[PDB]
Amino acid sequence: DVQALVVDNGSGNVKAGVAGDDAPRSVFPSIVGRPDAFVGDEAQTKRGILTLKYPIEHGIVTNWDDMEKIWHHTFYNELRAAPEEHPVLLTEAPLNPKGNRERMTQIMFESFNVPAMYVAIQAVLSLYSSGRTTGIVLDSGDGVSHTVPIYEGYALPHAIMRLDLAGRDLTEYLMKILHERGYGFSTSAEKEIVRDIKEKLCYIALNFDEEMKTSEQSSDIEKSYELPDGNIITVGNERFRCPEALFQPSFLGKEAAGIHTTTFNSIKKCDVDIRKDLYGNIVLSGGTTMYEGIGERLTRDITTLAPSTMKIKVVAPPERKYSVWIGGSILSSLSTFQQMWITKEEYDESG
Amino acid sequence: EHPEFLKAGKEPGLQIWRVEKFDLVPVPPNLYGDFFTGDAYVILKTVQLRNGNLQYDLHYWLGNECSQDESGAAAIFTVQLDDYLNGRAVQHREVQGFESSTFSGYFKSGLKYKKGGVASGF
Ligand SMILES: Nc1ncnc2c1ncn2[C@@H]1O[C@H](COP(=O)(O)OP(=O)(O)O)[C@@H](O)[C@H]1O
Ligand SMILES: [Ca+2]
Ligand SMILES: [Ca+2]
Ligand SMILES: [Ca+2]
Ligand SMILES: [Mg+2]
Secondary structure: OOOOOOEEEEEEEEEEOOOOOOOOOOEEOOEEOOOOOOOHHHHHHHHHHHHEOOOOOOOOOOOHHHHHHHHHHHHHHHHHOHHHHHHHHEEOOOOOOOHHHHHHHHHHHHHHOOOEEEEEEEEHHHHHHHHOOOOOEEEOOOOOOOEEEEEEEOOOOOEEEEEOOOOOHHHHHHHHHHHHHHHOOOOOOHHHHHHHHHHHHHOOOHHHHHHHHHHHHOOOOEEEEEEEOEEEEOOOOOHHHHHHOOOHHHHHHOHHHHHHHHHHHHHOOOOHHHHHHHOOOOEOHHHHOOOOOOHHHHHHHHHHHHOOOOOOOOOOOOOOOHHHHHHHHHHHOOHHHOOOOEEHHHHHOOO | HHHHHHHOOOOEEEEEEEEOOEEEEEEOOHHOOOOEEEOOEEEEEEEOOOOOEEEEEEEEOOEEEEEOHHHHHHHHHHHHHHHHHHEEEEEEEEEEEOOOOOOOOOOOOOEEEEEOOOOOOO
16 A cells, blocks of 8 residues: 655665665765764765765664664655655665664664564565576675575575675775876765766776786777866776776785685585576676676686586676665565565564 | 465466566466566466375566566565465476476467566556
8 A cells, every 4th residue: 555665775875765666766875974964965065074974884784873864864855755654675785683683673663663664685685676586696886795695585694795895995996096197086076086987987808818918909998088177087907907806806905705706605605406596597786796798707707617517697687786776666566565564563562 | 465375376276377567466267378478477386296285386487578577576476475385385487488398388288478468567
């Protein structure tokens, strides 16, 4: 009967909207600024007088007062919805501790008085949005990436991998390597420009060493970008060296495994009898999976790592930037959603 | 509580539902075996075992032109049905033109497709 609200609590941006829409109507940065408080874009608008905090910097909420300000902004400033009059679907990170889930549930029921809610794991929603019940989701967002094997609808928690390596690290790495050309982007505002350069110009090489060799033979690699002040910047091999850090985290000074190795290791944590279904359903999700070339490169790299009798398929849905939110929109629209949620009355008497 | 869940898996046979507007709607039995390319479906095959218990196979069939709400809902309804059947179903994803032999074998006349379908809920 009533329409649910869908809130994807992103490490970088909140995605929010109504159940039944094909995309979130609200997308804003998961930032709170204080000299009360400002949220999102208005808090960036006012960098100069506010101290900014990321209350969900790596996908797990760490500051509940700031997170409540984000949720208030979501309901009141973005959706103009009374939270006490709608069921809410909220997303959580893979491996979110139960105590953190319980705290978000307490806030929703006792600070916002939501009448019913459901908490969903982000990667599971993305898998459903791809039309699958079994597969492994590689979710790469702003402050965190995870690989999440899912079998017959349920994540396998012993096999989930977290990487503290996602889009914000790539933005910072592009800012670093552009110093080779003499650029000195360093301020917050400049970081947002570099993020846009990254999204517009970067791509993933099918074979990094060969791309380095071909790019140095001509200037065909170089592609340009108009800065806010009208000057033009030209970027060459940084276009593919930046997202190469996903595969080679040593470029960032990290000892971590790359995303191909991590995907492989997650599948191997699952029993042999289901691995074929995971290898055949590797589903990309999140903004940091949007690079041109990613599916082809991952296919080549995971095929090399995996047994040769496995059949590797990497699925890169065109709307994968918001697949978490979309999966939540579908789930909370189903005729069965009413039977999934927890009500405030139940919570208040036995929660 | 959903009426079609309450009907699911009670007797040996073949139950087919189409995703329509975020709901699971029975397919008219006259149309069994003919699938709209524009739609997604959930299929429960129930078999009587000699020991007396029932065996369940859940298939979700995705037409080449079905919308994302439909394919997503078919996947979710498959999980929810399996849960309602106490996890005792095996789940199978069936894509138009690449369906398993088991799925094809449920239809004596074989699988056929038809243009069109029910409108997306999105
Ligand atoms: N087209 C693109 N190419 C590469 N990176 C992108 C693209 N679009 C967005 N991103 C990056 O994706 C990240 C945001 O992804 P998102 O999935 O929304 O993260 P989260 O859910 O963690 O907030 C940012 O680092 C952003 O720069
Ligand atoms: Ca191999
Ligand atoms: Ca349809
Ligand atoms: Ca099962
Ligand atoms: Mg995310």
